[PDB]
Design a protein around this ligand. Structure first.
Ligand SMILES: Nc1ncnc2c1ncn2[C@@H]1O[C@H](CSCC[C@H](N)C(=O)O)[C@@H](O)[C@H]1O
Lengths: 148, 176
């Protein structure tokens, strides 16, 4: 019953989203988070470098999430970011934090950024770590940021 | 609004408590967790090693006419000598109260955690607030809970990342 990090990431963003909010999905990929966010927000901007439900309130952008300041102009209520690469960003996060409205939230799922969020001024941002401690395979963890 | 670890601890425990439940306050202190627990649980066992803790907590129980709490002047490591029933929820608040210096200690802390985890009901929860020889206890608790078998326990860390002066953090444990 304890929430997995991925579940809390959704809850965290959902708690502040409404049909007046703009949301960002900085790491589109499969589109699962885009869909989740589209149902809760006025509009969603989604980004990926890689090129049905009649949604229509979503804009897909193909060009570095770090190019946010060139695509979205309005204040942002909620944003989700994925971090970490499978065996085979910092300016983006910074720009999102700047654009977040008061009470706005950024969720970073992690599968230099840590060093950066740790450095944020506690009077202007609350940054919390939510991390499984006893999982045998190294699981994803969540960094929750709320703009004060 | 984003919860402080202390606020999440209360939420985490209240979610599984009811008037059939036995609850443990392993570190009575001034009694604030004991009083909270007594409102939700069938019965509360609260432990401290300082007489002052029982005096202060007793005063709160009297004011509120609380009848379902047993105060115990003995280490939380002795819990099995006092508590026979399965436990639904438990809390620790580590590292000293404003009254001199009788801090919680690694061995006694871990012994109490182990016994409480053995006694928890399936679905039961243990909340540990870690204040930080602050660091030796911190490390010992982290090292202990990390080795809990994932098939039997889910262990989550809830910790502030951008605050100065080493703020306390929460370890949440749920028995599977
Ligand atoms: N072995 C033990 N068993 C039970 N209680 C203990 C103990 N060792 C220390 N304690 C008690 O644990 C309590 C910790 S209260 C500290 C809470 C936290 N630092 C805060 O600021 O709120 C103290 O009352 C102390 O007397």
């Amino acid at each position: 019953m304890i929430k997995r990090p991925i579940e809390l990431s959704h809850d965290f963003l959902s708690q502040v989203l409404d049909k007046n909010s703009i949301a960002i999905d900085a790491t589109m990929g499969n589109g699962n988070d885009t869909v989740f966010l589209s149902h809760l927000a006025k509009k969603v901007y989604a980004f990926d470098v890689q090129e049905q439900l009649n949604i229509k309130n979503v804009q897909l952008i193909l060009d570095g999430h770090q190019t946010i300041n060139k695509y979205v102009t309005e204040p942002i209520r909620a944003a989700i970011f994925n971090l970490g690469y499978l065996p085979s960003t910092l300016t983006a996060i910074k720009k999102i934090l700047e654009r977040l409205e008061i009470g706005g939230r950024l969720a970073i799922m992690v599968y230099a950024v840590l060093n950066f969020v740790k450095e944020l001024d506690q009077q202007h941002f609350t940054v919390m770590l939510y991390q499984p401690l006893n999982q045998i395979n190294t699981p994803p963890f969540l960094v929750m940021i709320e703009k004060l």
